[model samples]
Each structure stands twice: as structure tokens, then as C-alpha cells.
Target: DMVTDLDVKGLGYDFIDLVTKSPDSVNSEHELAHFLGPHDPEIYVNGKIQTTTAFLQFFRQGLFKKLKDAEFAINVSGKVKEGEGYKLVWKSAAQRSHDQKIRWDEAEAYIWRRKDGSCWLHSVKFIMSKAAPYVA
Candidate 1:
């Protein structure tokens, strides 16, 4: 199964190559959205499930509010099962907003790819000793 170039904005990955070349990785807009958008992907902010839009909006808003000039890198950490999917870890660095105090060292996202080359988010987990609270 050949793939096209993958451009995932929501994540900053270090492992996945840009182009699949003959077998392009980013097959289509649907493939891009399928992996990063709110569809079948099950996303959890702190410890709860949120709809696709809910999580996207939540994180977008949080990023806008909490940090200044924030940049992150997402890396493929490991696998959860046999061939189901892979686990991801993201490290974000930014200047803390005046109103913000604590910070998180790393965050996690799980992804599952389908046979047709489409993928979706499985779970998102952020770990911090005293990270800010997330609200819907």
C-alpha cells in the first residue's frame, strides 16, 4: 500500500517522512482530516471523551490562552497492541502566560490507521504534575 506526503498540522512529528512518493502517504484531504479531525477518533482531554470539534476547539483555545509562542514536537513512542496502532508523545515548549503557573512535560496521542490509508486519533493524554485544567 503506497502512500502520499503526510502533512499533519495538529501534530509536530519527527519520524514520519513527508512523501510516500509513488505510493503517496497523504492520499487526500479526507485522509488528512481523518487522522487529525474529529471523526471516528476517540479523543480524551484530561480523562473524558470529547467530540471531534470539541477537542479541536478545546486545544486550540487553550493554546491561544495559555502559552505564548508555543511550539511542539510529536514523536512515535511505541505501540499499544499487536498491529492496532502506535503511541505518540509530544513535547511542547513555550513562554508561560502571565496568568499561567504550572506546565506539562509531555503529552500523548494515539492513532490508528485503516487499510485504505485513512487514519484517526485514538486517545490523547497530557501528563503534568500541576497542569492547567481543561473545560468544555
Candidate 2:
């Protein structure tokens, strides 16, 4: 069953700088490594709607790194599948310095959990850019 907005709000959405954004948020609330951001995205675990705070807890479980990378801007674009999961789109654009550009790899991800309704990362897939041409 779906939870309330507070359930979503309870799922804290301040990640980038964990300490600065969430002073009270500790590993106790959410153990997963994913960081919450401004404008919390509609998050779910195993088809059940989770509050922003609860979402953080489920998200902090493990190996949730790609979503927390500081080099890129990772935002929840929207849902990829109804009653399934979310779609994450991220990009690490070119860095310009001294008239030269430093390009980095960019990609998109589709993350979802199982139907049993558990706080476990069921699956995550990505589509990355060709870094060969930009290889230094």
C-alpha cells in the first residue's frame, strides 16, 4: 500500500552535503549511500510508496553510489514504469579551464526494487556516454 506525503517528507531529501543539509540525519535514519536532494522525487520500494524520509532509509542500504557522485547532477526525472520504479537522469558536462575543455562521462539510470515490498535495491541499469573520443 502507498504511504502518505509525510511518509515521503519523512524520507529526508537533503543529500549533497549530508551534514549541512541534514544535521540530524545519521546512518540511523537511512543506511543506504544514496543522497537525497532538493525537491524530493517520488520514491518507491517494492511497489510501495515511501515518504522522502522513509525513502532515504531504504536508499541507504548499500552500493547506492552512482546516485551520490558529486561530479554529476543526478535528478529523478520521473517514473519509468507505473507501479514499478523511478528513472534517474544525470550528466557531468564539460569543464572549461584556460580555454580548454575537460569532458566527463554522462549517463542515465533506471532503478527499481522487487514486488515483495522490501527495502532492497532490486535492479539498477545505466546508459553511458562514449568516453573514448574524450579520453585524455
Candidate 3:
């Protein structure tokens, strides 16, 4: 049941940790997406009120649908070399291929979770390019 060091992004069970704590708690109703990623009347980073709700809505609805049959569980996977709060270092495929190649190394956080009882995201932050492969 280990969520892996990489999967702890924005949440922490008695067993892990994640990036900036989410404004919403785990027990919140489904509509909690508003806080998680909905486009509200207020402005966020860079004065963006963008409804960037496409991915957010899908994620919420997808979980809700799966929760319908609690006996049936859904599990999400994550790659370490991707958010904050977690990272993994690996030599690039290209780097290892040649004896004289620049080591293209990078680390990234992962997003994964088990829908056993509730919806726990490995992270609340969107996987952005700048944050990707966070250089150490």
C-alpha cells in the first residue's frame, strides 16, 4: 500500500507528503474541484481566471464514476521523473547509449493514488513544463 516517495505530491497520509497543501481536505464533496482546479470569480497566478477546467472536470467525474461501485477499485500510476515534493534521477536513454554523451539527467515528481475509500491525488499542482524535470 505504499504510495511511493514519488507519488506523494500534495497530500500526506500518516505515511507520506506532497507539495503545497491543497486548499481542500480529503473528505470534501465532489464539487470540491472548484478549489482544486475550478475557475472561480477570483484570479489566481498571473491574474488567470481561465476555466482550465477541462482536465480538472474530467478527473473529478472519472473518480466519481468509479466510486459508484466501491467494491471496484481504481488505481492511478505515476512516473517519478515528472511534480514537486518528489523526484527521481535517472540517466537519459541517449546519455547511456554513447560513451561520450552529455548526461541528460532530470528528475520529476509523480502523481498516483488508490481509490480505496476516497479520492487522494498524488498532487494538486498541474504538471507544467517548467516544473518538469525539476533540476534537483
Q: RMSD for each model, in Å, please?
A: 9.4, 10.4, 15.0
Clashes of each: 8, 11, 6
Q: Per-prediction TM-score, please?
A: 0.45, 0.32, 0.20
Task: Report the lDDT of model 3 for residue 82.
Answer: 32
lDDT of each: 0.44, 0.38, 0.30
lDDT of 1 at 38: 36
Expressed as tens digits, the lDDT of each residue in 1-136 for candidate 1 is 2242152322324223211112344232223234355344565556667656665465455531221122344445455343455566544563355545545445456765544444456666544233566453
Candidate 1 residue 36 Cα shift, in angstroms, is 2.3
Instruction: Using TM-score, rank the candidates from best to worst.
Output: 1, 2, 3
Which candidate leads in lDDT?
1
lDDT per residue as tens, model 2, 21-111: 4435554224233443333444444344554565555446532233334144445635545345544444434444342444333433344
Can you tell me which runs of candidate 3 are displaced by over 4 Å? 1-10, 14-35, 38-52, 59-64, 67-136
Residue 128 displacement in candidate 1 (angstroms)? 6.6
lDDT of 3 by residue, 1-136 (tens): 5444433332333222112234365423233344435223121212223233643454455522222111211223344333322222222222333334333322122233343422333333222211123243
Predicted structure 3, TM vs. truth: 0.20
Model 2, 17: alpha-carbon shift in Å? 7.1
- Pitting candidate 1 against candidate 2, the one with the higher lDDT is 1
